[PDB]
Each structure stands twice: as C-alpha cells, then as structure tokens.
Paper text:
The type II AAA + ATPase Drg1 is a ribosome assembly factor, functioning to release Rlp24 from the pre-60S particle just exported from nucleus, and its activity in can be inhibited by a drug molecule diazaborine. Here, we report Drg1 structures in different nucleotide-binding and benzo-diazaborine treated states. All structures display a typical three-layered architecture, similar to those of type II AAA + hexamers, such as p97/VCP and Cdc48, and the NTD, D1, and D2 rings show an apparent deviation from a perfect sixfold symmetry. Comparisons of these structures indicate that Drg1 hexamers transit between two extreme conformations, a planar and a helical state.
To understand the structural dynamics of S. cerevisiae Drg1 hexamer, we assembled Drg1 hexamers in vitro in the presence of excessive ADP or AMPPNP (a non-hydrolysable analog of ATP). To better understand the structural dynamics of Drg1 hexamers related to the nucleotide hydrolytic cycle, we analyzed the structures of Drg1 hexamers obtained from three different samples (ADP, AMPPNP, ADP/AMPPNP/benzo-diazaborine). In these datasets, only a small fraction of particles displays an approximate six-fold symmetry. Most 3D classes adopt asymmetrical conformations, with one or two subunits more flexible than others. An intriguing observation is that the nucleotide binding pockets of D1 domains in the structures of different datasets are all occupied, either by ATP or AMPPNP, even for the Drg1-ADP sample. Although the structure from the Drg1-ADP dataset was not resolved at atomic resolution, but the local densities suggest the presence of ATP in these D1 sites. Therefore, this co-purification of ATP with Drg1 implies that the D1 ATPase site likely has a high affinity for ATP and a low hydrolysis activity. There is no obvious nucleotide occupation in the D2 domains of the structures from the ADP and AMPPNP treated samples.
Residue numbers in the entry:
A (entry chain A): 28 to 205, 220 to 776
B (entry chain F): 391 to 776
Write the structure that this text describes.
C-alpha cells in the first residue's frame, strides 16, 4: 500500500567491502510490492537510457529510508548517476548467457605495470555483479608504492540477443584464491567507441575561463568542505551565487561539470514545470524540496530560468505564480540552518530581467560576471576541443588555430562548436559528392571546409554591449612621437601612480579629449589602447547607444558605466559624441538632454571615479556643449591633426610590404612629398586604388608601375579643405 | 515605499505617528562599524580606531546592509588570499587588514547610488575659503530663527525665509552649502538640478511634494537647491515646453495659503536672467548676495591649504607673490592649477617633497583664467538694478 512512485539515489556509507556492486539498499516493503525475490537481480529505471543497469539486489537493516536508495559509487560513475536524479524500480530482465573477454585498460597510466598487478583478477571478479561497461574501485592498500590508479574495462566482444540492454551485463566465472579465456590483460587505449557510453564532464573541458573557474571552485568548496571554520567567524554563510551572462557563453556546461565533480548531493530543477494551476501545489513542492535539502547536511540547489519563474513586480503583474512563491522560498531558506553547508547557483541571463527582490548580500552576495570570450579564451577552447577530439582524425598546426581564433572576434562559445560541427558536415558532404564514397579517414580536417564554415555559418551574436573588434600592433600606429609619448604618459600615470595620487590628493584628471580631422588617427587609437595597455577595453559607438524607446539610452549608459566601474580600473572609449552632444545647436529631444545631464553628473558628480579613465574622441569638437566642458573634467586636449611625412611614409612602407620596392624603383619619398595633404586612410585608399589599377592590366601582378601611381593620384583628391584646418587651429587657440 | 501605500491608510486619524528612517550618515556608519567590530571581538582580527574612522569617512552612500556586505567580502577575500598564498595556513594569524577592505569597497558597487536626498560630506571652517562679511551675514541669518522664533511669534515679523545666491560659476557656490550644513548642526538636504526633472509627466510634481513635506516633517531646517536656472526660465528658454507646473508649485509652496516660519529657504543660481519675474518679487527671495570671486585672503588661504602636503621652506615661496599674480582666478581654478603644478613637479622623478616655482609658472602660463569681464559687468548691473 506504500506505492513508491519515485526514488532518489544516495551514496553508500561506511566504505568497508560489503557488496560494493550490488548493495541495493531498498526497504523490504518495496521488494514485496514488486513481487520479486530479494535474492535476485534488480532493475533501476533511472528514467530513460534503457538497459536499466541490471544488478543483483540485497537487503537493508530497516534503518535505510524508503525514499533514498544506494547503487554504489562504481555504478554511479559508470552510469553518470548524478545525485538528485529521478530513479525508478521495475522487474528484472532475463539471465545473461555468458561473458567472453572482459579486458582491462589501465586509465591515466603508462601500462607496463607487471609488479603493480599482483593478481588483479581476484579483486575484479571476487564480487557479485561485475558489469563490464565499467568497474571503478579505489586503489586500496596493496604492497608498497602508494599512489592511486583506475582501470578501464569498457572494451568487450560479447554479443547479446536483445539490443535494448546497453549495459549488457553478464555473469562472472574466474578461478582464483585469496582464468577467463586466453588472458584478460591487454591494450591501454581509451574507452570503446562502439558502446558510446556517456562520460562525466571534467574541468579540463572548460577552457578560457580560468580566473573564474578557480573563483567558483573556491566559492563552492569553502562552505561545503570547511563549514566549521567559516561558522567560527559568525558572519553568516553565503547561500547564493549569481551566474549571469550572455546565452551560450558556457554556464550550463560549468553547472554540469560542478554537479558531476561534486560527491555531495545536488538538487536539479527543470524550471517552470513546477508551476501548477493549484495555488498551494507549488508552495508544497517548494517547501518539500527545501525539507529534503535541509534534512541532509550536504545539499546543493540548482535553479534555472529564474526570470520566467520570478518576473519583476514592476515589469508585469501577470499573477498566478508571482513574488509570493519567491518570498516564501526566501523565508524558508533564510532560517533553514545556522552553519550548514549549502550553496545555491542561479544560472540566469541579463540580470536586468532578474527581479530586484533577489539581490541582498545576506543570501546572494556572490556574483559571477561572465562576458564574451576574447581571442585568448577562444584559442584556448579551440586547443581544448582539438585535444578532446584527438589528432588521429585531424591535422592542424598551432598557427592555423591562432589565425582561426583571431578571425572569429565576435563569436560566442557555442559558435566554436557550431563551426567545428559545420566543418565536419561540409567535409563529409564534399567527400561524398566528389570522391564517391572514399575512405573518410584520409579526408580528415582541412582549411577549405572551415573557411566555408565561417562564411556560411551566419551567427546571430553581432549586437552586444561588448565590442571585441580586432586589434593591431605598433606597426600600424602611424603618427607623431609627441602624441605617442603623451598617450604613454596618461596611460601609465594611473597604473603606477595611484598611491602617489592618494598620498598627494591630486588624484587623476581622468579626462582626455581627441578632436581632429575625420581622415585618420581617431579610430586606430582604440586599437592602440586595447593592444598596448593590456587592460579590459570597452568601446561604445555613438548611434549604437541611441534607441527608439525613451530612456533606453539612459539605462544603457547606466549599465555600461556601472560595468566599467565594476570591471576594475580600466579605460572607457566613446567613438562618436557629436551626435548626442549638440543639445543647443539642434533642437534634439528630451532624451538627449537627459543623457547630457547624466553624463555631466556621473563623471565627477557626488562620487568620483578615480580608478577608471575617461577618454573621448570626437570629429567636430564644437558640438560638445560648454555646460559640461568645464576645467577639471575632460580638460586635456589633443590636436591630433593630419599625419606628418614620417607617419605617411611608415603607412606607405606598411602597405607596400606585399609588393616589392626594389623592382618598382620607388623609395616612397617623392611620393610622400607629393602626397602631403592627405590622411592615413586617404593614403591607404590611394594605395588600394593603385593596386587595383595595376592588377587590372594583366590580372595578377608581382609589382606596381609608376603610371598607376600617377593615375591614382590624379583620380582621387584629398577631400579636405584648408579652411577646416584654419577653423581647427582657431578652436585650439581658444582652448 | 510610503508613496506606494494607499493614501487612505496614511491619514492622521489612524496613522498620525510616522517614524522616518533615513540613510545612515558618517557618524552612524562609524558607530555600527565599531559595534560590529566589538561584536566579533579582537581575538580574530585587529582594527585600530583611526582605520575605522577613515573607512567610515570614505563611506558616503552605503547602507546598513552595505557594512555587512563589506565585512563578509573582506573576510572571504582574506580566506581565498590565504589559501592561495600561504597554502592553507591558520586563518587566525592572517586576520583582517586594510587592503582587503579597500578591495571590498572598490568591488562592492552598491546599487543604492540613486537617492532623492543626498548626504553631502561635511567640511570644516579652515578648509572653507571665503570673506568675513559673508560669513558674518550667513551666521546672523542662521542664528536669527533658532533662538528668535519665540521673539518673532510675539512680534509677528517672522523671517524673510528667502535667500538667493547669484555669482560666477567658479567657486563659493557648492562648498558654501557644505559649510552651512557643517556649522549649523542641522540636517541638510541636497538635490541636483536635473535630478528633480523626470521623463514622466507628473512625477516631478510628486517628487516636489515629497521633498517639501519631508522638509516640513524634518523640523525647522534649511532647504538648499544646487541650481535653479535649470528650471526657472520658462518663456526665455522654453525648456521642452514644460516646468510651468513645477514653477507654480514651488511658487505656491513657499508663501501660498500656509506660510513656513520655522524653515529657511536658500537658493543658489548660476545666472540671474533665468529667474522668472514671479520669483523676483519683494517678500519672497528678497535677499541677494553678490558672492563674487574670492579675494586675496581667500586665495592665500586656499594656496596655504594646498601647500600643506608640500614643504614651503624647501620650495622657498612666501605664498604672497603667487597669490598676487593669481588674482583673476577662482577657488576651483586655484585648486586645479595647484593640482596641475603638482603633477608637473612629480613628472620628473615620481614622488617629490616640494614643488618648484618653475612648475608653478609653467602651470600658470599653461592654463588661462577662462573668465570674461562681460559676465562680471552683467552681474554688477544686476546687483545695481536689484
Ligand atoms: N565558452 C564555451 N566553451 C566551450 N563550449 C561552449 C562554450 N559555451 C557554450 N559551449 C558549448 O555549447 C553548449 C551550450 O552551452 P551551455 O551548456 O554552457 O549553456 P548556455 O546556453 O550558456 O546556458 P543557458 O541555456 O542557461 O542560457 C555547451 O554544452 C558546449 O558544448
């Protein structure tokens, strides 16, 4: 009459020896209700993945509760039986015929053990069960030589009539005291591919997020493994960690990794499915799951899609499930225990949608900032996945991987898997189309398929707050030495003069203005900073910050400056100011005025942002209103005029690297003297036009002739008027 | 939110007693810090008094929960740093220091930085640089109400309740409010110009009502506005064809139907032409202060204050000829010039013990005053016409 609908897994305590493969501590009432002999095999449904891990069954001492069951850590590791999963029980299957090979693999070892063996056969098949897809046991205490090793037993050649049983367990028959069929020790490779059994995710899979990975490791290990030390302080234990970031940036994968690597019990929810029409059903479910969380000392709770579960009060008062359940769960978890060991991880997205009623340091102090991976993280993930898929199926050197990572700048973490899989299908398709079903092992991975892959992938991750556009080195930096020296001075002062400023009280002006001609030397500065500074660089476009909705620009400004402040002492760059700055010359709207006042009162109002440095580059400086153009904020001014002869010559040399200067007979000195009124972008465009004219003569060329140079020079003019330079000089004089 | 509460509930018939809880100030934050430090005792950490005072002074907008947040963040950062560096050493030996607290206050980033009532940090008289006549005037104007309300009740004269501050945008407009708040020993209210402005129509009126009846419920005090010229001009500037309701509300609040004898209203504006003729009427805001550029004495005092960090004897400057040469500047201008001169003096060999006269001359010639005589002439004409 008990009718146990569901079961939950539980680790086997007390170690000892016991069964260790066929423990199966289930209450005798459940066994009687299943009309199955206790002294026989038992089957655990584990909801899905048929085969059911058929295993012999034993009896308990009436102390083991009915709800929890034990399946031994060996089977838990074999079948990835994560704690808190749904477990079911049903009738046993048919008796297996026999076992054939059962061969050891000696995982994470160099094999050649001979002495370390010491008759492993008795240990392997001195126990009931022995399921050949996997046995994982402790090293125990054998002879001298300490250490710890594991064994792979996956490979086998036995054939079973029913294909439903993917675990295809068989009986055990070996002779020993205190031998299979023609020895049982051979090979050392990885697990058998034909079974394709699931594997537990490890920390080695996650790459490019180290500075966060050890942070989260410590955040989950200090309370769980050291509860007494933290409780001695008496400052209350943290009961929540915020995992927020753009979708597909590697959050659920780390959730799975930490769930698999932790032996403690973990609670996993599927999200809004708990929400029910009955008002009290969700409350009862929440209080119940909290009861199992608090009754067991080790417990970790996972919550997902909190925004759907907990909508903002002001955003929409839909009703039904609302902040009532949030309040009751917060009250339940507030006083569940005094010290305990409980950590809650919230894998949410864009915390603006997260209800403001979920943010106090008392329970949710820990916040994890996840952003778009940079080129280094993308390259690291590429290397990790290449190592995972092994070199037996592909050939690729390091520089090609680096170039691929550099090419993909705005791509997301999941985009890397997208590209590799798309390259796989493209290679298979081209092989089938061309070679007419040739051996696909020799085709492997090439560059053409990957090139077509990122040509045709078309990701939907272009519009983001982060702007990780590709950078250039000092070779492309064509300008004046004084400008570079000033740049170095004002980017090295806050890095190694913070203590001096604090002692003196001068602090930092934190304001640099870059106004000049629209030719060049106004956009390459962002690359120069992002390259040489080695600090997290944020760039916001002018029209990008503008939005149709009223106040959207203001709130976006709020998030961008709050994240700049929270992202350590760094530099903020705004590309185009003269669209929102002219609130007096043009009528504009109230949103532009609100933006102007917000940016005026946030840079140096109320609170001072000493850590961050604010630099702004604008085309026409007269659009900036004099209300915010006050000494003490953005006081520094740089003329940054047209490039001189040296910068133009350097740009010409850089652009002429592909061509051969010796055969052309040009030193690029007379051309530089003639091309004095142009800009760096103008020089690049003229060089491109000259190259196009040269290659239109006889298709591909190895050199460029003078006639193309004169044709390009006469075809395109400077496009800049001297009166603009005079006006710039007049503005500089008044400043 | 008291506003979100049903106004039917919030009536004196049932809920006449209201307990107002505001943001803790420096003193309250220091008291809470000391109390919690004594709570977890010195057996696990060492924290001398002056470090606690410095931490409390550095805290401006933090809330009661923020102190606990900082404590927990510092403790956990100490734990991780000890585990990373000392390889699981005893945590009692590492205890608590100042650098982890500084890192915690840098990285805490509270979301309560927006508030209707601003607690502007206090400043002492010696740091304040002004003129003797203005100081005597403000002292008299603030001493009259507190110990003359009973005399005015019998006399019936009451108080002018209106003070207007118009002058150059250089200085003597912002730090004056801090000096008044410090010396008066009365709760101070600071609201920015565009802060009262809101996108929603009618939200500004509700904020105006909010601030005035909190001022009324906060005992006879002083109400100061950072700048009025951002909303006072309606016909002259035509600011989004709005603010007329705000102007009418502020006109009828000060002296409409009900008169506020206890409180004193002080106004500071950056330009006189933006004030409408309705406000420029005898009886309300009649008092006007020229509050011009600082004189020689104030500039000399500011230079002496800024030179305290450096050594005057080593530099050799007498702090008189520099003040005489820099006569057309302002207090903020003087501070900025001193900061830039210090930067120039430290560019050579990083930290220095003194600033040379050559660096001061470089600063003076590099940066101009930026002030024109036409605005001074207009201010003088307005003073004569007033
Ligand atoms: N940074 C990354 N590095 C490597 N693989 C990644 C990364 N981000 C995503 N992936 C791949 O894409 C899959 C989906 O990502 P993940 O499971 O982390 O979910 P998510 O989309 O970030 O989370 P959610 O659905 O909660 O928003 C991963 O299982 C992994 O295969």
């Amino acid at each position: 009459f008990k009718l146990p609908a569901e079961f939950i897994t539980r680790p086997h305590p007390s170690k000892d020896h016991g069964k260790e493969t066929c423990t199966a501590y289930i209450h005798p009432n459940v066994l009687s209700s299943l009309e199955i002999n206790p002294g026989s095999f038992c089957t655990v449904g584990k909801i899905g993945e048929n085969g059911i891990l058929v295993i012999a069954r034993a009896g308990d001492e009436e102390v083991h509760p009915v709800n929890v069951i034990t399946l031994s850590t060996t089977i838990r590791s074999v079948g990835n039986l994560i704690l808190g999963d749904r477990l079911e029980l049903k009738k046993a299957q048919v008796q297996p015929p026999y076992a054939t090979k059962v061969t050891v693999g000696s995982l994470q070892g160099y094999n050649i053990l001979e002495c370390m063996e010491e008759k492993v056969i008795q240990k392997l098949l001195d126990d009931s069960g022995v399921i050949m897809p996997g046995m994982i046991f402790q090293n125990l205490k054998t002879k001298a030589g300490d250490e710890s090793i594991d064994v792979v037993i996956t490979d086998a050649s036995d054939d079973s009539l029913p294909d439903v049983s993917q675990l295809d367990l068989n009986m055990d028959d070996m002779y020993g005291g205190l031998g299979s069929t023609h020895i049982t020790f051979s090979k050392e490779t990885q697990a058998n591919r034909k079974y394709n059994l699931p594997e537990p995710l490890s920390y080695a899979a996650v790459g490019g997020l180290d500075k966060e990975i050890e942070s989260l490791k410590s955040a989950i290990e200090i309370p769980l493994h050291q509860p007494t030390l933290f409780s001695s302080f008496g400052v209350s234990p943290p009961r929540g960690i915020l995992l927020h970031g753009p979708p597909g940036t590697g959050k659920t994968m780390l959730l799975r990794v930490v769930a698999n690597t932790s032996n403690a019990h973990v609670l996993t929810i599927n999200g809004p499915s708990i929400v029910s029409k009955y008002l009290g059903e969700t409350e009862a479910a929440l209080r119940d799951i909290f009861n199992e969380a608090r009754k067991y000392q080790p417990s970790i709770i996972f919550i997902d899609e909190i925004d759907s579960i907990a909508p903002n009060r002001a955003n929409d008062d839909s009703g039904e499930v609302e902040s009532r359940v949030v309040a009751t769960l917060l009250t339940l978890m507030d006083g569940m225990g005094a010290a305990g060991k409980v950590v809650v991880i919230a894998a949410t997205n864009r915390p603006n949608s997260v209800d403001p009623a979920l943010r106090r340091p008392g329970r949710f102090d820990q916040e994890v900032e996840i952003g778009i991976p940079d080129v280094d993280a993308r390259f690291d993930i590429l290397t990790k996945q290449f190592s995972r898929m092994s070199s037996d199926r592909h050939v690729l050197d390091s520089e090609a991987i680096k170039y691929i990572a550099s090419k993909t700048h705005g791509y997301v973490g999941a985009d890397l898997t997208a590209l590799c899989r798309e390259s796989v299908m493209k290679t298979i398709q081209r092989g089938l189309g061309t070679d007419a079903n040739i051996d696909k092992f020799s085709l492997k991975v090439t560059l053409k398929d990957v090139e077509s892959a990122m040509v045709d992938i078309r990701p939907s991750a272009m519009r983001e707050i982060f702007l990780e556009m590709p950078k250039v080195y000092w070779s492309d930096i064509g300008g004046q030495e004084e400008l570079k020296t000033k740049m170095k001075e004002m980017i090295q002062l806050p890095l190694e003069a913070s203590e001096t400023f604090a002692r003196l009280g001068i602090s930092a002006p934190k304001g640099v203005l870059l106004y000049g001609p629209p030719g060049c030397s106004k956009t390459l500065t962002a690359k120069a900073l992002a390259t040489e500074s080695g600090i997290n660089f944020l760039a916001v476009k002018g029209p990008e910050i503008f939005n149709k909705y009223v106040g959207e620009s203001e709130r976006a400004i709020r998030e961008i400056f709050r994240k700049a402040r929270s992202a350590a002492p760094s530099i903020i760059f705004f590309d185009e100011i003269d669209a929102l700055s002219p609130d007096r010359d043009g009528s504009s709207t109230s949103a532009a005025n609100h933006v102007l006042t917000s940016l005026l009162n946030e840079i140096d109002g109320v609170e001072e942002l000493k850590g961050v440095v604010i630099v702004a580059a604008t085309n026409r400086p007269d659009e900036i209103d004099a209300a915010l153009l006050r000494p003490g904020r953005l006081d520094r001014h740089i003329y940054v005029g047209p490039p001189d002869v040296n910068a133009r010559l350097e740009i010409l040399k850089k652009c002429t690297k592909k061509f051969n200067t010796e055969e052309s007979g040009v030193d690029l000195h007379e051309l530089a003297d003639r091309t004095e009124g142009y800009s760096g972008a103008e020089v690049v465009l003229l060089c491109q036009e000259a190259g196009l004219a040269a290659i239109m003569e006889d298709l591909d060329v190895a050199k460029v002739e003078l006639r193309h140079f004169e044709k390009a020079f006469k075809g395109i003019a400077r496009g800049i008027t001297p009166e603009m330079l005079s006006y710039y000089e007049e503005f500089a004089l008044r400043s």
